[PDB]
Protein backbone atom coordinates (compact mmCIF):
# COMPACT_ATOMS: atom_id res chain seq x y z
CA UNK A 1 0.00 0.00 0.00
CA UNK A 2 1.28 3.44 -1.01
CA UNK A 3 -0.46 5.08 2.00
CA UNK A 4 0.93 3.58 5.23
CA UNK A 5 0.15 6.74 7.20
CA UNK A 6 -0.91 6.18 10.81
CA UNK A 7 -3.70 8.78 10.64
CA UNK A 8 -5.72 6.66 8.22
CA UNK A 9 -9.33 7.82 7.88
CA UNK A 10 -9.64 6.95 4.18
CA UNK A 11 -11.79 3.99 5.25
CA UNK A 12 -14.60 6.40 6.19
CA UNK A 13 -14.05 8.38 3.00
CA UNK A 14 -14.86 4.97 1.53
CA UNK A 15 -17.90 5.22 3.83
CA UNK A 16 -18.79 8.67 2.42
CA UNK A 17 -17.84 8.65 -1.28
CA UNK A 18 -16.99 4.99 -1.89
CA UNK A 19 -19.38 2.12 -2.54
CA UNK A 20 -19.76 1.28 1.16
CA UNK A 21 -21.33 4.71 1.83
CA UNK A 22 -24.64 3.06 0.88
CA UNK A 23 -24.83 1.19 4.19
CA UNK A 24 -23.57 4.20 6.13
CA UNK A 25 -26.66 5.92 4.74
CA UNK A 26 -28.81 3.37 6.58
CA UNK A 27 -26.59 4.00 9.61
CA UNK A 28 -27.48 7.70 9.55
CA UNK A 29 -30.95 7.80 7.97
CA UNK A 30 -32.09 4.50 9.55
CA UNK A 31 -34.00 2.79 6.74
CA UNK A 32 -34.83 -0.87 6.25
CA UNK A 33 -32.01 -2.68 4.42
CA UNK A 34 -32.40 -5.94 2.50
CA UNK A 35 -29.57 -8.49 2.55
CA UNK A 36 -29.14 -11.49 0.24
CA UNK A 37 -26.69 -14.01 1.70
CA UNK A 38 -24.83 -17.04 0.44
CA UNK A 39 -27.28 -19.69 1.72
CA UNK A 40 -29.95 -18.54 -0.78
CA UNK A 41 -31.37 -16.61 2.17
CA UNK A 42 -32.61 -13.04 2.42
CA UNK A 43 -32.33 -10.67 5.39
CA UNK A 44 -34.30 -7.46 5.97
CA UNK A 45 -33.38 -5.18 8.86
CA UNK A 46 -31.54 -2.05 10.01
CA UNK A 47 -27.75 -1.79 10.20
CA UNK A 48 -26.02 0.03 13.07
CA UNK A 49 -22.25 -0.38 12.62
CA UNK A 50 -19.78 -2.07 10.27
CA UNK A 51 -16.38 -1.60 8.65
CA UNK A 52 -14.33 -2.30 5.51
CA UNK A 53 -14.97 -6.05 5.81
CA UNK A 54 -18.69 -5.17 5.47
CA UNK A 55 -19.52 -7.18 8.59
CA UNK A 56 -22.36 -5.41 10.36
CA UNK A 57 -24.80 -5.55 13.27
CA UNK A 58 -28.55 -5.37 12.69
CA UNK A 59 -31.67 -5.09 14.85
CA UNK A 60 -35.29 -6.22 14.41
CA UNK A 61 -34.58 -8.37 11.37
CA UNK A 62 -36.79 -10.76 9.42
CA UNK A 63 -35.05 -13.56 7.52
CA UNK A 64 -36.83 -15.66 4.91
CA UNK A 65 -35.67 -18.79 3.09
CA UNK A 66 -37.49 -21.28 0.88
CA UNK A 67 -37.57 -25.07 1.31
CA UNK A 68 -38.57 -27.79 -1.13
CA UNK A 69 -42.29 -30.57 -1.41
CA UNK A 70 -41.63 -27.57 -3.66
CA UNK A 71 -40.20 -24.15 -2.72
CA UNK A 72 -42.25 -22.50 0.03
CA UNK A 73 -40.68 -19.47 1.71
CA UNK A 74 -40.64 -19.56 5.52
CA UNK A 75 -39.94 -16.64 7.84
CA UNK A 76 -38.46 -16.32 11.32
CA UNK A 77 -37.81 -13.22 13.40
CA UNK A 78 -34.52 -12.26 15.07
CA UNK A 79 -34.27 -9.30 17.44
CA UNK A 80 -30.57 -8.33 17.23
CA UNK A 81 -27.66 -10.04 15.51
CA UNK A 82 -24.42 -9.65 13.58
CA UNK A 83 -23.65 -10.86 10.05
CA UNK A 84 -20.15 -11.65 8.83
CA UNK A 85 -19.25 -9.56 5.80
CA UNK A 86 -17.93 -12.26 3.47
CA UNK A 87 -21.17 -14.28 3.84
CA UNK A 88 -23.21 -11.92 1.64
CA UNK A 89 -24.03 -11.64 -2.06
CA UNK A 90 -25.73 -8.23 -2.36
CA UNK A 91 -26.70 -5.37 -0.04
CA UNK A 92 -29.84 -3.36 -0.77
CA UNK A 93 -31.38 -0.23 0.68
CA UNK A 94 -35.12 -0.76 0.34
CA UNK A 95 -36.60 1.38 -2.46
CA UNK A 96 -38.67 4.51 -1.94
CA UNK A 97 -42.28 3.35 -2.29
CA UNK A 98 -44.02 6.47 -0.94
CA UNK B 1 6.38 -14.77 17.09
CA UNK B 2 6.50 -14.97 13.29
CA UNK B 3 6.45 -18.58 12.07
CA UNK B 4 4.15 -21.12 13.69
CA UNK B 5 5.10 -24.43 15.26
CA UNK B 6 3.08 -26.69 12.88
CA UNK B 7 4.97 -25.32 9.88
CA UNK B 8 8.18 -26.17 11.72
CA UNK B 9 6.87 -29.70 12.32
CA UNK B 10 6.11 -30.02 8.63
CA UNK B 11 9.67 -28.87 7.92
CA UNK B 12 10.88 -31.68 10.19
CA UNK B 13 8.86 -34.23 8.18
CA UNK B 14 11.12 -33.80 5.13
CA UNK B 15 12.74 -37.10 4.20
CA UNK B 16 10.12 -39.33 5.84
CA UNK B 17 6.95 -40.98 4.47
CA UNK B 18 3.87 -38.70 4.40
CA UNK B 19 0.29 -39.12 3.14
CA UNK B 20 -1.42 -36.08 1.62
CA UNK B 21 -5.16 -35.43 1.22
CA UNK B 22 -6.14 -32.56 -1.09
CA UNK B 23 -9.60 -30.99 -1.36
CA UNK B 24 -10.33 -33.17 -4.40
CA UNK B 25 -10.29 -36.15 -2.04
CA UNK B 26 -7.07 -37.52 -3.54
CA UNK B 27 -4.67 -39.27 -1.16
CA UNK B 28 -0.93 -38.95 -1.89
CA UNK B 29 1.42 -41.11 0.18
CA UNK B 30 5.11 -40.67 -0.55
CA UNK B 31 8.51 -39.43 0.56
CA UNK B 32 8.34 -35.73 1.42
CA UNK B 33 11.34 -34.07 -0.24
CA UNK B 34 10.79 -30.40 0.59
CA UNK B 35 8.30 -28.04 2.18
CA UNK B 36 8.00 -24.29 2.49
CA UNK B 37 6.49 -21.94 5.05
CA UNK B 38 3.27 -22.46 3.14
CA UNK B 39 2.05 -26.02 2.72
CA UNK B 40 3.61 -26.30 -0.76
CA UNK B 41 4.91 -29.87 -0.58
CA UNK B 42 7.35 -31.40 -3.04
CA UNK B 43 6.95 -35.12 -2.42
CA UNK B 44 7.97 -38.26 -4.25
CA UNK B 45 7.17 -41.96 -4.83
CA UNK B 46 3.43 -41.40 -4.61
CA UNK B 47 0.90 -44.15 -4.03
CA UNK B 48 -2.14 -42.09 -5.01
CA UNK B 49 -5.71 -43.14 -4.18
CA UNK B 50 -8.54 -41.27 -5.91
CA UNK B 51 -12.05 -40.72 -4.58
CA UNK B 52 -13.35 -43.87 -6.27
CA UNK B 53 -10.45 -45.87 -4.80
CA UNK B 54 -8.20 -46.30 -7.84
CA UNK B 55 -4.52 -46.58 -6.89
CA UNK B 56 -1.69 -45.31 -9.08
CA UNK B 57 2.07 -44.76 -8.88
CA UNK B 58 3.57 -41.34 -9.64
CA UNK B 59 7.22 -40.65 -8.90
CA UNK B 60 7.24 -36.83 -8.58
CA UNK B 61 4.51 -34.61 -7.15
CA UNK B 62 4.30 -30.93 -6.15
CA UNK B 63 1.14 -29.93 -4.28
CA UNK B 64 -0.06 -26.36 -3.86
CA UNK B 65 -0.18 -25.47 -0.18
CA UNK B 66 -3.60 -23.81 -0.31
CA UNK B 67 -5.12 -27.08 -1.52
CA UNK B 68 -4.20 -29.39 1.37
CA UNK B 69 -6.92 -30.40 3.80
CA UNK B 70 -4.71 -32.23 6.31
CA UNK B 71 -1.31 -33.89 6.45
CA UNK B 72 -0.56 -37.08 8.38
CA UNK B 73 2.98 -37.12 9.71
CA UNK B 74 5.11 -40.02 10.94
CA UNK B 75 4.81 -40.79 14.65
CA UNK B 76 8.50 -40.30 15.49
CA UNK B 77 7.99 -36.58 14.91
CA UNK B 78 5.98 -36.68 18.15
CA UNK B 79 9.43 -36.66 19.79
CA UNK B 80 10.65 -33.59 17.92
CA UNK B 81 12.28 -31.04 20.27
CA UNK B 82 9.93 -28.46 18.75
CA UNK B 83 6.97 -30.48 20.11
CA UNK B 84 8.13 -29.99 23.71
Amino acid sequence: EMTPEELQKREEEEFNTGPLSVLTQSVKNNTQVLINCRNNKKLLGRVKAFDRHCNMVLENVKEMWTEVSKPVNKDRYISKMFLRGDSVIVVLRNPLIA
Amino acid sequence: MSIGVPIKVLHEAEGHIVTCETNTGEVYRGKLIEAEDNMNCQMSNITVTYRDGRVAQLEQVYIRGSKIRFLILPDMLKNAPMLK
Partner: protein, 81 residues
Protein backbone atom coordinates in the same frame (compact mmCIF):
# COMPACT_ATOMS: atom_id res chain seq x y z
CA UNK C 1 -13.15 -2.68 13.70
CA UNK C 2 -16.37 -4.49 14.59
CA UNK C 3 -14.54 -7.56 15.93
CA UNK C 4 -13.45 -5.38 18.86
CA UNK C 5 -17.16 -4.97 19.57
CA UNK C 6 -17.50 -8.77 19.68
CA UNK C 7 -14.53 -9.03 22.07
CA UNK C 8 -16.39 -6.67 24.42
CA UNK C 9 -19.31 -9.14 24.59
CA UNK C 10 -17.72 -11.61 27.01
CA UNK C 11 -19.96 -13.78 29.22
CA UNK C 12 -23.22 -13.68 27.28
CA UNK C 13 -25.51 -16.49 26.11
CA UNK C 14 -25.76 -16.51 22.31
CA UNK C 15 -26.38 -18.78 19.32
CA UNK C 16 -24.18 -19.03 16.22
CA UNK C 17 -25.17 -20.23 12.75
CA UNK C 18 -22.34 -21.65 10.65
CA UNK C 19 -21.82 -22.00 6.91
CA UNK C 20 -22.58 -25.70 7.43
CA UNK C 21 -25.87 -24.70 9.07
CA UNK C 22 -24.76 -25.75 12.56
CA UNK C 23 -26.55 -23.82 15.31
CA UNK C 24 -24.45 -23.77 18.49
CA UNK C 25 -26.10 -22.29 21.60
CA UNK C 26 -23.71 -21.34 24.37
CA UNK C 27 -22.09 -18.62 26.44
CA UNK C 28 -19.28 -16.74 24.71
CA UNK C 29 -16.02 -16.76 26.69
CA UNK C 30 -13.33 -15.47 24.33
CA UNK C 31 -13.12 -13.80 20.93
CA UNK C 32 -10.00 -13.32 18.81
CA UNK C 33 -9.14 -10.34 16.59
CA UNK C 34 -9.75 -12.78 13.73
CA UNK C 35 -13.26 -13.49 15.13
CA UNK C 36 -12.11 -16.94 16.35
CA UNK C 37 -14.80 -17.70 18.93
CA UNK C 38 -14.56 -19.94 22.00
CA UNK C 39 -17.79 -20.86 23.78
CA UNK C 40 -18.63 -22.68 27.01
CA UNK C 41 -21.81 -24.48 28.08
CA UNK C 42 -22.64 -25.00 24.41
CA UNK C 43 -25.74 -26.60 22.88
CA UNK C 44 -24.87 -27.49 19.27
CA UNK C 45 -27.53 -28.49 16.75
CA UNK C 46 -25.87 -29.54 13.51
CA UNK C 47 -28.57 -29.45 10.84
CA UNK C 48 -30.15 -32.78 9.85
CA UNK C 49 -28.93 -34.26 13.16
CA UNK C 50 -30.15 -34.33 16.75
CA UNK C 51 -28.67 -31.74 19.14
CA UNK C 52 -25.82 -32.68 21.48
CA UNK C 53 -24.75 -31.05 24.76
CA UNK C 54 -21.10 -30.26 25.49
CA UNK C 55 -19.00 -28.24 27.91
CA UNK C 56 -16.63 -26.19 25.73
CA UNK C 57 -16.43 -25.37 22.03
CA UNK C 58 -14.20 -23.34 19.71
CA UNK C 59 -15.32 -22.22 16.24
CA UNK C 60 -12.91 -20.84 13.64
CA UNK C 61 -13.60 -17.23 12.72
CA UNK C 62 -13.76 -18.04 9.00
CA UNK C 63 -16.49 -20.67 9.44
CA UNK C 64 -19.00 -18.39 11.23
CA UNK C 65 -22.03 -17.53 9.11
CA UNK C 66 -23.64 -15.07 11.54
CA UNK C 67 -24.24 -14.19 15.20
CA UNK C 68 -27.38 -14.14 17.34
CA UNK C 69 -27.71 -11.50 20.09
CA UNK C 70 -30.13 -11.42 23.05
CA UNK C 71 -32.43 -8.51 23.89
CA UNK C 72 -30.61 -7.05 26.94
CA UNK C 73 -27.42 -5.87 25.15
CA UNK C 74 -26.67 -2.07 25.32
CA UNK C 75 -24.89 -2.28 21.91
CA UNK C 76 -24.79 1.56 21.74
CA UNK C 77 -22.26 1.95 24.63
CA UNK C 78 -20.46 -1.14 23.29
CA UNK C 79 -19.80 0.20 19.76
CA UNK C 80 -18.02 3.32 21.07
CA UNK C 81 -14.32 4.06 20.63
Amino acid sequence: KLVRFLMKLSHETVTIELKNGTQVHGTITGVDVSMNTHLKAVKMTLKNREPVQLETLSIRGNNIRYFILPDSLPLDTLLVD
